[PDB]
Design a protein around this ligand. Structure first.
Ligand SMILES: C[C@@H](N)c1ccc(-c2cncnc2)cc1
Ligand SMILES: C[C@@H](N)c1ccc(-c2cncnc2)cc1
Ligand SMILES: [Cl-]
Ligand SMILES: [Mg+2]
Ligand SMILES: [Mg+2]
Ligand SMILES: [Mg+2]
Ligand SMILES: [Mg+2]
Lengths: 194, 194
């Protein structure tokens, strides 16, 4: 019933552009929206986010997260490891590379989502959520070597999966950080299950 | 260590703006970023709310109540948690219960309310509270729920069992052109992983 009529460029930066979208509502009334898009997509999606399950025998399973200064937020955020998918990369492979660059961990693909939207009221940004287990007992993950590209400054924070939500709430209360909504959603459902 | 130096307007719409952010990196070097922000945020603790609505009924498996809407930024239909912006002076909890009723017809009870969490911190400053609400579907008020959408809001309600949410979401994605929201997918993945 609904569809895009036209998109007017309002402003293009190097990384992000702003558009005026004209669309047909289900009545037959023409309406407008202000949309954002990244200029970097071709791809299955703009990016990947990695859910990295760190498994070490005789330890709690942990979820590996990253803390970074985020200039749109003017502050530090706690997120799943994540980045853009390179021209001609599969989402799986983008996931293992990002996880290594950002955390030093080398992991295994467990499962891969379809393309899912980041903030559909605002942007067309999409990611694949890639679940990855990390054999924390293998020698290659013993002393993880993070390989951060230019201008990435990443702190690695591992939290137990079985208490994820309480541990994040504690970091927020103590450290003036913003947790990522996907992280929080995941943490919430771990408590809401069963 | 890192902090904002300046924020320069590039382009302001009625609803969304684009800014050039200058910040200090942890090496002591100036860098820039392109930041999106919504024009509607005032004194709220966040831009919006998303509602995790747990529909409870005697002799029924618990359902998660979701909404399907056309999203002009995406050029297509998206499956999301019920959600909207927080009105000036409104509490996140009030916004949540109101949005939930407007979009779905259901009258919820507050369970919990997150701190403000970021939607896409590499792109925007946009934040929400994620509000978990239970719906007593045995209450006569919630028997034949009537949406009360606002102007230009066109919503379909989809209720899926919590105990099979991820497979049911995948089935819907198999049947049509539609994108699942990343928070919904994250929550569904955690329910499997638990
Ligand atoms: C119903 C009407 N008051 C309205 C119309 C469009 C929008 C909007 C939101 N985000 C991006 N672009 C446009 C908000 C409100
Ligand atoms: C590596 C460095 N040239 C760089 C710097 C900034 C960004 C960026 C991304 N999204 C929005 N705004 C800015 C991407 C890359
Ligand atoms: Cl897992
Ligand atoms: Mg990253
Ligand atoms: Mg990266
Ligand atoms: Mg809404
Ligand atoms: Mg609404």
């Amino acid at each position: 019933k609904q569809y895009i009529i036209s998109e007017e460029l309002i402003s293009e930066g190097k990384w992000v552009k702003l558009e005026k979208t004209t669309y047909m509502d289900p009545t037959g009334k023409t309406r407008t929206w202000e949309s954002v898009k990244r200029t970097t997509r071709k791809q299955t999606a703009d990016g990947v986010a990695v859910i990295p399950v760190l498994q070490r025998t005789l330890h709690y399973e942990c979820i590996v997260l990253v803390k970074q200064f985020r200039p749109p937020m003017g502050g530090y955020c706690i997120e799943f490891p994540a980045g853009l998918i390179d021209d001609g990369e599969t989402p799986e492979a983008a996931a293992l590379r990002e996880l290594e660059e950002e955390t030093g961990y080398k992991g295994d693909i467990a499962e891969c989502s379809p393309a899912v939207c980041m903030d559909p009221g605002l942007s067309n940004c999409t990611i694949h959520i890639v679940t990855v287990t990390i054999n924390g007992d293998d020698a290659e993950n013993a002393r993880p070597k993070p390989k951060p590209g230019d201008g990435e400054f990443v702190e690695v924070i591992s939290l137990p999966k079985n208490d994820l939500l309480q541990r994040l709430d504690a970091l927020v209360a103590e450290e003036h950080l913003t947790v990522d909504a996907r992280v929080y959603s995941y943490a919430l459902a771990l408590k809401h299950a069963n």
